[PDB]
Paper text:
Modification of the carbamate group was carried out; however, most of the analogs such as amides and esters are not active, demonstrating the importance of hydrogen bonding between Ser228 and the carbamate group (3.0 to 3.5 Å). When replacing the carbamate with various heterocycles, only [name] with pyrimidine showed moderate activity (MIC=2.5 μm, IC50=370±133 nm). The [name]–TCA1 structure revealed that the two nitrogen atoms of the pyrimidine ring occupy the positions of the two oxygens of the carbamate group as H‐bond acceptors. Based on these structural insights, we introduced a methyl group at 4‐position of the pyrimidine to gain a hydrophobic interaction with W230 (TCA787), which has similar activity to TCA1.
Mtb Decaprenylphosphoryl‐β‐d‐ribofuranose 2‐oxidase ([name]) is a flavin adenine dinucleotide (FAD)‐dependent enzyme, which together with decaprenylphosphoryl‐d‐2‐ketoerythropentose reductase (DprE2), converts decaprenylphosphoryl‐beta‐d‐ribose (DPR) to decaprenylphosphoryl‐beta‐d‐arabinofuranose (DPA), an essential cell wall component. Multiple covalent and non‐covalent4 [name] inhibitors have been identified and showed in vitro and in vivo activities against Mtb, further validating [name] as an attractive anti‐tuberculosis (TB) drug target. Here we report the X‐ray crystal structures of WT [name], a TCA1‐resistant [name] mutant, and [name] in complex with TCA1 analogs.
Residue numbers in the entry: 7 to 268, 284 to 316, 331 to 461
Write the structure that this text describes.
């Protein structure tokens, strides 16, 4: 039933061989964990979703990896309570399509829909709406967690077991296997957005636009920014902001089915600067999800706290003068954090960059880690495969508190991964 498979993260780096169990039968998963628990802990077990983490959080060299994607039943959707009850292997695209006809919207969508609900919880994912909706864990009402002793515990965010609930959110699979969850969805009358677009000429303008108060008027907001040009052009951005449309805001063509989801010689001169400004400046444009949201590399994402604006500008300056060129760059201002110890988002300047693998890059991102740490920020474990334990621990000062929860729920270290070992979360 288990196959020896070479597994990697999305970045296709640091591979390890594991026995991969792939079964639609939940009882076989219970017994596999029972087999691991009795085997003297060994090199343990980890759950795998769709393999979309860039890191090593869903591989376990010389141990067991449980593929959760065959557990992909939607058990119920209720439009009155807004609740969805789903197997942990359901993906967000499947969930999005099943939920729309009930006038229900997935409360947090990331930059891809090909992620499992189990992965969304364990990485406590965020999206364009973080500053208004928080992260994924904010909307989970219950989950069923297969723990180290082969018992399935029913966890809720408040009441008895809250501590373990909140350790599982952002816990990277290290408290056990999420088998099943109940999610509160966002009500919607349409599958469309009304969107405003803005184009800033500089890092100073981009920052200015995010702190001038206009952010409170939009439920969704993010930006593509320039990380390659010299100042003054460094940090200029195309900002995309909006909210879900109501039926009366749609054009007539679309109002019958409101919830249906189905390089030239001018480019780098004054004329195209104008073109790009015109095309990226608009108000009240009706967009579907695809238009608004879903249009040898090292991914790197960090957040710097809100008040550390001058420090944020400095990190961006360090990035462009490094000789490492990142063309695809996402910037967002995060809102309030949640109570999960290992949750990534904190209020502040969030940035995702992507560097081509090249001489000197590993040592340069270590230096970046140091800057991010010193400025009170942290890195995202769904993007990272190379930070040290000591860096991570200083970035997440509630780690000891989390570790304490993990010891009670897994005394024999049944649940283990390459990431847990590297980051000394074991
Ligand atoms: C193109 C792209 C865009 C992205 N955009 C964003 C974004 O905008 N925002 C954001 O937050 N993230 C983003 N991500 C990261 C992604 O959302 C997370 O890495 C997510 O956790 C991956 O889900 P997965 O099912 O593929 O999980 P995997 O990558 O397979 O596993 C991730 C972690 O979840 C745990 N896990 C998986 N299933 C279970 C389970 N049933 N029980 C317990 N633990 C489990 C694993 O053990 C592992 O620790 C992006 C990734 C890609 C490739
Ligand atoms: O974290 C990410 N995006 C974030 S963080 C906060 C907001 C957003 C975000 O808004 N994503 C996004 N926005 C517009 C178009 C496409 N994606 C991404 N990581 C990767 C990695 N590879 C490809 C795309 C992305 S988006």
């Amino acid at each position: 039933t288990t196959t020896a498979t070479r597994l990697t993260g999305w970045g296709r780096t640091a591979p390890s061989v594991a026995n991969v169990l792939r079964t639609p039968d939940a009882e076989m998963i219970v017994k596999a964990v029972a087999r691991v628990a009795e085997s003297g802990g060994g090199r343990g077990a980890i759950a795998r979703g769709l393999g979309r983490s860039y890191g090593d959080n869903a591989q376990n060299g010389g141990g067991l990896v449980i593929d959760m994607t065959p557990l992909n039943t939607i058990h119920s959707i209720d439009a009155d309570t807004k609740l969805v009850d789903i197997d942990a292997g359901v993906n967000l695209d499947q969930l999005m399509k099943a939920a729309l006809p009930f006038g229900l919207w997935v409360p947090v969508l990331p930059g891809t829909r090909q992620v499992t609900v189990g992965g969304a919880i364990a990485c406590d994912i965020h999206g364009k709406n973080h500053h208004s909706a928080g992260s994924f864990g904010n909307h989970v009402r219950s989950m069923d967690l297969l723990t180290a002793d082969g018992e399935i515990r029913h966890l809720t965010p408040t009441g008895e077991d809250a501590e373990l609930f909140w350790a599982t959110v952002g816990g990277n699979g290290l408290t056990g296997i999420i088998m099943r969850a109940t999610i509160e969805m966002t009500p919607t009358s349409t599958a469309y957005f009304i969107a405003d677009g803005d184009v800033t000429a500089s890092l100073d303008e981009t920052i200015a636009l995010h702190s001038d108060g206009s952010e409170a008027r939009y439920t969704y907001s993010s930006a593509w920014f320039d990380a390659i040009s010299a100042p003054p052009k460094l940090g200029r951005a195309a900002v995309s902001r909006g909210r879900l449309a109501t039926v009366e805001q749609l054009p007539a063509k679309l109002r019958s089915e409101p919830l249906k989801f189905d390089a030239n010689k001018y480019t780098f001169g004054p004329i195209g600067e104008l073109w790009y400004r015109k095309s990226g400046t608009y108000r009240g444009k009706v967009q579907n999800l695809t238009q608004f949201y879903h249009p040898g590399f090292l991914q790197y994402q960090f957040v710097i706290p809100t008040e550390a604006v001058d420090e944020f500008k400095k990190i961006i300056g360090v990035i462009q003068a490094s000789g490492h060129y990142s063309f695809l760059n996402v910037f967002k201002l995060f809102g309030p954090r949640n109570q999960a110890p290992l949750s990534f988002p904190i209020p502040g300047w969030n940035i995702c960059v992507d560097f081509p693998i090249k001489d000197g890059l590993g040592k340069f991102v270590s230096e970046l880690d140091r800057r991010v740490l010193e400025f009170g920020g942290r890195l995202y474990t769904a993007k990272d495969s190379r930070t040290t334990a000591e860096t991570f621990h200083a970035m997440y000062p509630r780690v000891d508190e989390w570790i304490s929860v993990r010891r009670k729920v897994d005394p024999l270290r049944v649940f283990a991964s390459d990431m847990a070992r590297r980051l000394e979360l074991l």
